[PDB]
Amino acid sequence: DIQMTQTTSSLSASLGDRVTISCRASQDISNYLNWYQQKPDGTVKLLIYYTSRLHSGVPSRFSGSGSGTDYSLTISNLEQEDIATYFCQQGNTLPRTFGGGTKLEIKRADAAPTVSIFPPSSEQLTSGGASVVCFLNNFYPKDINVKWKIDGSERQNGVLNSWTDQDSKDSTYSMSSTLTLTKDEYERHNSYTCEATHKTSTSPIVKSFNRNEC
Amino acid sequence: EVQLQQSGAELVRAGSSVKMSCKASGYTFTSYGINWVKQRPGQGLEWIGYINPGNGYTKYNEKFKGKTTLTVDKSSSTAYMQLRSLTSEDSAVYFCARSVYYGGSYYFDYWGQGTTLTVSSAKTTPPSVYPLAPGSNSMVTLGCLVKGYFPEPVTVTWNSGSLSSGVHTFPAVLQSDLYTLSSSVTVPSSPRPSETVTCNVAHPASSTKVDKKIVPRD
Numbered sequence: 001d002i003q004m005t006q007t008t009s010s011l012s013a014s015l016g017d018r019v020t021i022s023c024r025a026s027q028d029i030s031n032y033l034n035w036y037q038q039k040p041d042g043t044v045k046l047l048i049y050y051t052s053r054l055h056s057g058v059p060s061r062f063s064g065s066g067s068g069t070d071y072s073l074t075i076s077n078l079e080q081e082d083i084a085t086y087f088c089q090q091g092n093t094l095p096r097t098f099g100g101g102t103k104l105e106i107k108r109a110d111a112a113p114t115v116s117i118f119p120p121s122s123e124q125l126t127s128g129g130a131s132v133v134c135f136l137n138n139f140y141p142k143d144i145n146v147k148w149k150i151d152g153s154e155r156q157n158g159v160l161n162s163w164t165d166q167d168s169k170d171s172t173y174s175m176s177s178t179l180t181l182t183k184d185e186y187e188r189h190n191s192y193t194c195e196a197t198h199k200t201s202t203s204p205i206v207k208s209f210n211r212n213e214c
Numbered sequence: 215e216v217q218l219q220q221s222g223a224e225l226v227r228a229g230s231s232v233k234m235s236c237k238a239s240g241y242t243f244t245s246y247g248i249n250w251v252k253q254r255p256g257q258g259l260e261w262i263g264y265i266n267p268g269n270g271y272t273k274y275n276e277k278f279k280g281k282t283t284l285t286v287d288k289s290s291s292t293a294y295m296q297l298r299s300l301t302s303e304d305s306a307v308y309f310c311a312r313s314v315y316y317g318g319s320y321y322f323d324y325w326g327q328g329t330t331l332t333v334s335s336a337k338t339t340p341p342s343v344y345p346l347a348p349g350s351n352s353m354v355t356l357g358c359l360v361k362g363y364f365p366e367p368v369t370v371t372w373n374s375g376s377l378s379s380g381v382h383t384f385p386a387v388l389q390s391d392l393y394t395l396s397s398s399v400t401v402p403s404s405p406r407p408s409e410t411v412t413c414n415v416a417h418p419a420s421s422t423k424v425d426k427k428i429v430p431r432d
Contacts, residue, residue, distance in 0.1 A: 095261050133359060137355070174382045178359075
């Protein structure tokens with residue numbers, strides 16, 4: 001079939017900026033390309049159709065063009081309501097295909113994460129399990145990496161991570177990393193480290209604790 | 215107004231099946247095709263297939279054919295989709311949208327709110343709230359771990375909501391066939407452990423409400 005490519009999963013902009021999301025077919029779509037918008041709440045709406053250009057009931061700031069393989073959507077003046085995920089869609093050949101989507105986000109001044117680590121709770125230890133959690137909150141841009149070190153080394157297994165969409169008051173992101181072991185394994189070692197690597201600085205921000213010290 | 219109300223979310227065991235609804239309104243049901251898209255967290259929409267209510271002519275996307283069957287009721291102007299012998303990769307959100315004409319080639323001008331299909335076999339199970347406290351400067355972050363529950367959702371709050379700003383409740387993750395999530399709150403050092411900081415975790419499905427107090431030391 002026809003593969004639709006949208007270079008840029010996430011795209012940054014300020015409110016009031018001309019924004020452009022690209023989309024490129026794996027072949028000549030003969031100008032049969034559509035564009036859908038999808039709000040965070042999940043709903044989907046049609047914006048433009050037929051190689052872009054053709055509107056629906058949508059605001060004037062939305063514009064579109066393209067031809068053959070290369071197409072694009074442009075929002076002359078970005079509005080808060082505009083913040084969402086945009087998918088393009090070729091209606092030239094079956095099966096109908098969709099691009100990867102591009103999700104706008106706002107431009108914040110780089111931040112550097114606030115890192116906190118938390119040993120396991122007695123309550124959970126009694127259950128025989130043990131989980132060490134670590135929060136990397138309010139940071140920007142969204143790209144980040146969290147590294148767990150037990151007794152000063154490796155550790156990949158037992159690590160589970162969660163991320164949040166951009167905040168709506170400040171435009172930061174946050175992340176929750178969780179390493180779960182067995183009570184026994186947790187007692188066979190001493191220092192647990194949560195290292196955070198963020199462009200915000202070349203030296204990882206390190207937080208950890210020693211059991212013998214608790 | 216053109217309206218498409220899809221069925222509620224469905225929780226069903228793998229191997230089984232399920233038929234979801236999509237009910238059109240504000241326009242002539244048989245004059246416009248219906249298509250179904252599939253969306254998994256892992257971005258992108260997948261074009262399931264398209265059915266013409268007037269004739270019942272379906273057209274499937276090879277990758278869904280066989281396990282999927284598109285039907286309709288040209289009476290209650292309602293469109294249906296059936297997914298058989300479910301796998302986990304069936305877990306997702308399904309949209310039905312009306313397809314339309316200009317310049318030779320259709321497009322979807324109206325979508326539904328989508329239905330959420332979750333394929334699991336765990337059962338209504340309460341979570342275990344675990345307090346997250348620093349061990350034995352100006353601002354202090356505390357937490358609360360909600361592990362081993364099912365199915366979503368679970369509602370978290372701090373001090374019955376009196377602590378709103380500076381809170382972060384992370385999306386859940388499937389641990390061992392169950393769900394687990396965390397939640398943080400950043401309050402000044404004067405507040406805790408001075409005063410009380412408590413997480414309020416509610417898990418509806420199991421009719422469970424929990425208030426765990428974050429106390430000093432491990």
